[PDB]
Design a protein around this ligand. Structure first.
Ligand SMILES: O=C(O)c1cccnc1C(=O)O
Ligand SMILES: [Mn+2]
Ligand SMILES: [Mn+2]
Ligand code: NA
Length: 605
C-alpha cells in the first residue's frame, strides 16, 4: 500500500494528495521496483541519458554537442490508428455513426471492453523497472490557456523526450498544487524477467499495443509502444484528443496547426495558423526562410495550436509544446535551413542513419559526405546509396534553439491569429491559393480537405484532424460554426493552399520552399482589406498580376490557377458522398448548405 520505501527521488509526502493517489494506486497496480519523481533538472537529464547509454538503449553522436541516437524495434516505429481508441458511454459522442461503411473519423471502445483490455495488460507490467513520475505543463507555465499533466512511465526514453517536448519538472508540481490534471499512464509492457526477446534494446509489446483516451475520466492510458505519438502522451493524446473535447466543452479550439508570425517591409506583423495533413510540410512553412526582401518569418510552433477568443474578440493562439518532434527524412539546408541549425545541439534522434564520424544521415539530406565517411543505417547495418533512415524517423529538439523562434512564443496571453490556412497534396485541379467566401464556407473548406498519400490514393483528412478528433466530427463542425455567433469574435480569414500542383508531365508548377512567402504576402494583403482578389466558384484567387512573381521568371499562372468545371463537378460530388456517409445525421445544416452552393456555382460555369 505505502510505496514510500521505493521512491528514489522526490517524496510521496511532498506531492499533492490527488497526485499521490494517482502515483501510488498505479504503483500498486503496475508494481514498479522504484519510483522516480522527475525534477526536470539538467543533472537528472544528463544522468538518465548516460544510463540509457550504459544499457545500449541509446548511442551518443560524437560529432555534435550533446546529441543522441535511438534505434528501435522495427515493429514499433509509428502511431497505430487501428489500436488508438476513445472511450465514452455512447459511441455517437466519439464518432459519427456512418451511413454505409466503417468510420474513418475515429475509433470507439466501450468502457467494458477497455476495462478487460486494461486488466489483461497493466497488472504487474512494470516489475523490476523504475516508474518515472513526470509532472508537465502544456503551454507557457503562467498561461491561463496552459494545462497540466502527470505522466507515469517506465521508459527513460519517454522521460528525456518529454523534457524536450513539454515543460517538465518540479516547478510544474509547485504550480499545479491541488488543481486538476490529466492523468497519463504509459508502460512499454515488458515486465522483468522478460517473457519475450528484446529487439535492438527497445522494449515494446506490439501484440498488446493500445493507446486509450477516457475524456470523461480525464485519463490517457497507453500500453506497449515507446514511439513518440504513442508514448509522449502530452502531444497527440492530450493536446489534440483530450483537449479538443475540453475545447468543445469550454468554447475554445485545439487544432493540428502550426503557428507562425510574419512581418512585412513596413514593420507590421501578423500571426497565421495552418493545418496540413501528417504527410508533412508544416515544419517547413513554420520555419520558412522567406525569399522576398524585407519580409520576416518567425516560428511559434509546428504542430499543435490551442486557440481561444479573448474579451476583445481576438483569436489568441499558444503552442502547447516545448519542442519540435519533426520528421527527419527530407530535411535539408535547402528545404529547412532553420531546422538544421536547431538540431545540432541537445537533440535526440530516433531511427536515422549514423555516419562513421558520429553524424546523422537520412534520405533527402542533400549533404555530400567526404570520401572516407561510411554510413550505418537505422537497422544497424553498413549502408550504401533500402533506405538508410526509417521514413517516419525523427528529431526531438528544443523550440528555444530555433534561430527564428518568435519572441512571443511563450507569452502567456498567446498571439492573435488573423488568418487560417488549410491545404493538401493535390496533383490536379486545385489552385495554388484561394480564399474562402465567408466563415461558413471556410469551415466547409476545412471539412473538404483531401490529400494524396505517399497507384496513388487521395484520402480525406478534414482539418488535418482525421487521426486526432477527440469527439464526434459533426459536433466538431458545429463547434467551429458556433464561433460566428460569439459576442465580439473577430473571425480570421480562411485560406486554402496547394503546393503540389503538377503540369501534364508530372512536374510541380510552383517552386515552393521560401517562394511560398509570395503567397503569404497575398494573404497578408487580403487581411488588410486589399482589392487583390478575383471571385471564382471555389472562392477568391489572386487577380491578374496580384502576386509578386519577380525573380522567378515565367511561372505558368493560368494552369496554376486553372479551375475546370469537369474536375470540380467530380470534386463536389465526391465530397458530398463522403460527408453524407461519414458525418451522416451529424452533418450541420450550414455545411450541407455550402456544399449545395458550391455545386450551384460550378453548374453555372
Ligand atoms: O505522431 C506523429 O507521427 C506525429 C509526430 C509529430 C508531429 N506530427 C505527427 C503527426 O502525425 O501529425
Ligand atoms: Mn502532427
Ligand atoms: Mn450560423
Ligand atoms: Na536500440
Amino acid at each position: 500500500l505505502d510505496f514510500s520505501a521505493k521512491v528514489i527521488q522526490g517524496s510521496l509526502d511532498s506531492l499533492p494528495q490527488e497526485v499521490r493517489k494517482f502515483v501510488e494506486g498505479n504503483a500498486q497496480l503496475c508494481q514498479p521496483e522504484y519510483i522516480h519523481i522527475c525534477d526536470g533538472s539538467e543533472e537528472e537529464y544528463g544522468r538518465l541519458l548516460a544510463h540509457m547509454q550504459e544499457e545500449g538503449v541509446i548511442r551518443k553522436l560524437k560529432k555534435y554537442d550533446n546529441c543522441w541516437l535511438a534505434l528501435t524495434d522495427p515493429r514499433d516505429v509509428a502511431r497505430i490508428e487501428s489500436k488508438t481508441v476513445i472511450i465514452t458511454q455512447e459511441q455517437r459522442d466519439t464518432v459519427p455513426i456512418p451511413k454505409s461503411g466503417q468510420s474513418q473519423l475515429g475509433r470507439w471502445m466501450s468502457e467494458e471492453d477497455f476495462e478487460k483490455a486494461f486488466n489483461a495488460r497493466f497488472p504487474g507490467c512494470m516489475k523490476g523497472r523504475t516508474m518515472y513520475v513526470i509532472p508537465f505543463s502544456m503551454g507557457p507555465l503562467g498561461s491561463p490557456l496552459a494545462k497540466i499533466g502527470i505522466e507515469l512511465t517506465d521508459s527513460p526514453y519517454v522521460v528525456a523526450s518529454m523534457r524536450i517536448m513539454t515543460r517538465m519538472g518540479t516547478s510544474v508540481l509547485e504550480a499545479l498544487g491541488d488543481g486538476e490534471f490529466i492523468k497519463c499512464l504509459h508502460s512499454v509492457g515488458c515486465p522483468l524477467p522478460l517473457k519475450k526477446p528484446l529487439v535492438n534494446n527497445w522494449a515494446c509489446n506490439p501484440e498488446l499495443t493500445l493507446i486509450a483516451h477516457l475524456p470523461d475520466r480525464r485519463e490517457i492510458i497507453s500500453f506497449g509502444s515507446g514511439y513518440g505519438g504513442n508514448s509522449l502522451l502530452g502531444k497527440k493524446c492530450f493536446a489534440l484528443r483530450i483537449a479538443s473535447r475540453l475545447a468543445k466543452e469550454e468554447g475554445w479550439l485545439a487544432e493540428h496547426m502550426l503557428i507562425l508570425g510574419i512581418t512585412n517591409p513596413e514593420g507590421k506583423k501578423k500571426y497565421l495558423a495552418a493545418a496540413f495533413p501528417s504527410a508533412c510540410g508544416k515544419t517547413n512553412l513554420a520555419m520558412m526562410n522567406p525569399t522576398l526582401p524585407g519580409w520576416k518569418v518567425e516560428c511559434v510552433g509546428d504542430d499543435i495550436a490551442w486557440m481561444k477568443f479573448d474579451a476583445q474578440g481576438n483569436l489568441r493562439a499558444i503552442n502547447p509544446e516545448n519542442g519540435f518532434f519533426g520528421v527527419a527524412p527530407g530535411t535539408s539546408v535547402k528545404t529547412n535551413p532553420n531546422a538544421i541549425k536547431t538540431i545540432q545541439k541537445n537533440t535526440i534522434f530516433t531511427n536515422v542513419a549514423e555516419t562513421s564520424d558520429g553524424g546523422v544521415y537520412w534520405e533527402g539530406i542533400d549533404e555530400p559526405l567526404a570520401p572516407g565517411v561510411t554510413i550505418t543505417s537505422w537497422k544497424n547495418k553498413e549502408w550504401r546509396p533500402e533506405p538508410c533512415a526509417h521514413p517516419n524517423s525523427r528529431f526531438c529538439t528544443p523550440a528555444s534553439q530555433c534561430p527564428i523562434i518568435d519572441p512571443a512564443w511563450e507569452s502567456p496571453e498567446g498571439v492573435p491569429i488573423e488568418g487560417i490556412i488549410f491545404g493538401g497534396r493535390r496533383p490536379a485541379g486545385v489552385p495554388l491559393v484561394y480564399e474562402a467566401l465567408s466563415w461558413q464556407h471556410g469551415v466547409f473548406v476545412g471539412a473538404a480537405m483531401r490529400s494524396e498519400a505517399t497507384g496513388k490514393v487521395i484520402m480525406h483528412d478534414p482539418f488535418a484532424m482525421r487521426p486526432f478528433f477527440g469527439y464526434n466530427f459533426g459536433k466538431y463542425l458545429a463547434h467551429w460554426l458556433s464561433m460566428a455567433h460569439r459576442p465580439a469574435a473577430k473571425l480570421p480569414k480562411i485560406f486554402h493552399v496547394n503546393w503540389f500542383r503538377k503540369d501534364k508531365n508530372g512536374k510541380f508548377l510552383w517552386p515552393g520552399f521560401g517562394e511560398n512567402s509570395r503567397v503569404l504576402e497575398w494573404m497578408f494583403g487580403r487581411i488588410e482589406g486589399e482589392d487583390s482578389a478575383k471571385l471564382t466558384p471555389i472562392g477568391y484567387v489572386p487577380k491578374e498580376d496580384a502576386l509578386n512573381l519577380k525573380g522567378l521568371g515565367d511561372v505558368n499562372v493560368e494552369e496554376l490557377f486553372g479551375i475546370s468545371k469537369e474536375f470540380w463537378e467530380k470534386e463536389v460530388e465526391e465530397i458530398d458522398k463522403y460527408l453524407e456517409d461519414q458525418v451522416n445525421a451529424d452533418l450541420p445544416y450550414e455545411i450541407e448548405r455550402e456544399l449545395r452552393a458550391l455545386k450551384q456555382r460550378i453548374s453555372q460555369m
